[PDB]
Amino acid sequence: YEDAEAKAKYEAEAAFFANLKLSDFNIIDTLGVGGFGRVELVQLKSEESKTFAMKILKKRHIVDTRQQEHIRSEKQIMQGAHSDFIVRLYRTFKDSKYLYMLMEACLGGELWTILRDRGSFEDSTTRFYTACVVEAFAYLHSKGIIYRDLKPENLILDHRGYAKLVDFGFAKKIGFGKKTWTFCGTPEYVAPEIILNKGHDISADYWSLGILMYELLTGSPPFSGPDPMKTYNIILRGIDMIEFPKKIAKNAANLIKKLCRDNPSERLGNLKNGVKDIQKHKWFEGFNWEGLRKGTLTPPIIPSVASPTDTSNFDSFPEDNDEPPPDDNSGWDIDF
Numbered sequence: 001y002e003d004a005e006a007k008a009k010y011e012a013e014a015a016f017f018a019n020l021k022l023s024d025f026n027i028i029d030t031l032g033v034g035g036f037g038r039v040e041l042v043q044l045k046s047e048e049s050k051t052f053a054m055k056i057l058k059k060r061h062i063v064d065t066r067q068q069e070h071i072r073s074e075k076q077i078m079q080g081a082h083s084d085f086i087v088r089l090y091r092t093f094k095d096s097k098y099l100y101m102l103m104e105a106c107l108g109g110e111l112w113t114i115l116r117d118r119g120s121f122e123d124s125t126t127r128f129y130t131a132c133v134v135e136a137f138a139y140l141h142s143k144g145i146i147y148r149d150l151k152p153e154n155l156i157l158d159h160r161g162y163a164k165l166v167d168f169g170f171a172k173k174i175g176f177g178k179k180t181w182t183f184c185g186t187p188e189y190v191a192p193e194i195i196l197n198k199g200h201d202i203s204a205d206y207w208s209l210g211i212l213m214y215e216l217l218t219g220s221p222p223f224s225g226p227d228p229m230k231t232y233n234i235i236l237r238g239i240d241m242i243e244f245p246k247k248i249a250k251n252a253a254n255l256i257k258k259l260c261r262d263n264p265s266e267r268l269g270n271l272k273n274g275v276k277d278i279q280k281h282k283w284f285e286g287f288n289w290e291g292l293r294k295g296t297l298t299p300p301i302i303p304s305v306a307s308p309t310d311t312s313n314f315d316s317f318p319e320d321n322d323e324p325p326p327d328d329n330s331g332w333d334i335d336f
């Protein structure tokens with residue numbers, strides 16, 4: 001906790017949610033669907049101004065895909081994180097078939113579709129979103145947590161236009177002085193030390209930050225092949241072999257190259273002053289970090305959200321008519 005005021009605020013919030021039951025909520029509309037389950041916008045019956053994104057997961061699909069540890073870690077990390085740049089997980093529920101994760105609703109919409117529709121983001125737009133991620137990473141890395149799934153698809157906008165990290169399925173708390181060893185992530189975004197199975201730590205995230213900048217500035221990540229093997233070889237060749245288009249400002253290219261160092265120990269953010277070295281890079285000259293943290297900074301893209309029940313920034317989905325999944329009572333979900 002930052003201080004005693006924050007400690008007390010979060011304990012009061014936890015006690016507020018501990019008292020709630022699934023029956024205290026109304027379903028408003030669906031935010032997303034898939035084989036994993038659905039994300040529903042839900043409303044607190046006793047306080048209609050409080051709405052939430054409830055991710056409802058079929059437990060059998062989690063077991064089939066061997067993601068029990070991933071979802072347990074997602075719960076622990078997300079429920080324990082208290083950052084304005086990370087979607088809050090307030091609490092969980094469970095029954096025999098489903099897990100329910102009650103999260104902060106971000107009603108501004110998905111960033112990746114905006115990026116696709118515009119082709120690429122201007123320098124100042126990209127700088128705002130990159131700074132949001134930089135703050136989220138400052139928090140996570142201060143707690144020894146690797147995020148490990150940075151990509152435009154895992155950035156969601158709230159109603160103001162602030163970006164937040166969602167989807168902690170690959171996030172992991174790493175022990176002090178330890179590395180982690182699982183080959184996972186999206187191929188274009190995986191760092192070379194993950195490809196070479198040398199173990200990785202929070203510095204892999206700084207690699208991903210570079211990729212993100214490049215993608216946001218150009219519409220595509222810098223390393224890409226026809227199949228993941230060629231992509232991995234390209235990655236192992238290094239960022240210094242990638243052509244930086246003139247579209248990318250010189251300071252942005254410099255920062256990307258410092259983030260995508262082959263050696264994790266040399267990556268900006270992993271040096272003497274940690275994430276502060278990223279924040280002081282000349283690309284961020286004139287960027288109001290204090291205003292970003294205070295919420296006074298004007299986002300580059302303003303979604304309009306008329307009310308806490310407005311889902312107009314999300315696709316429409318027919319309500320669930322699928323067969324209920326089989327019961328799952330193996331017991332790996334005790335803490336939920």
Ligand SMILES: Nc1ncnc2c1ncn2[C@@H]1O[C@H](COP(=O)(O)OP(=O)(O)NP(=O)(O)O)[C@@H](O)[C@H]1O
Pocket residue numbers: 031032033034036039053055087103104105106107110153156166167168169
């Ligand atoms: N807190 C949230 N607020 C608003 N929309 C959300 C929220 N969480 C998830 N969504 C939406 O639901 C989608 C699924 O979220 P996600 O955390 O990626 O679950 P998932 O199990 O990984 N589904 P998928 O990405 O298809 O594998 C997101 O891409 C968003 O469009």
Ligand SMILES: [Mn+2]
Pocket residue numbers: 153154167
């Ligand atoms: Mn996702």
Ligand SMILES: [Mn+2]
Pocket residue numbers: 167169
């Ligand atoms: Mn996902």
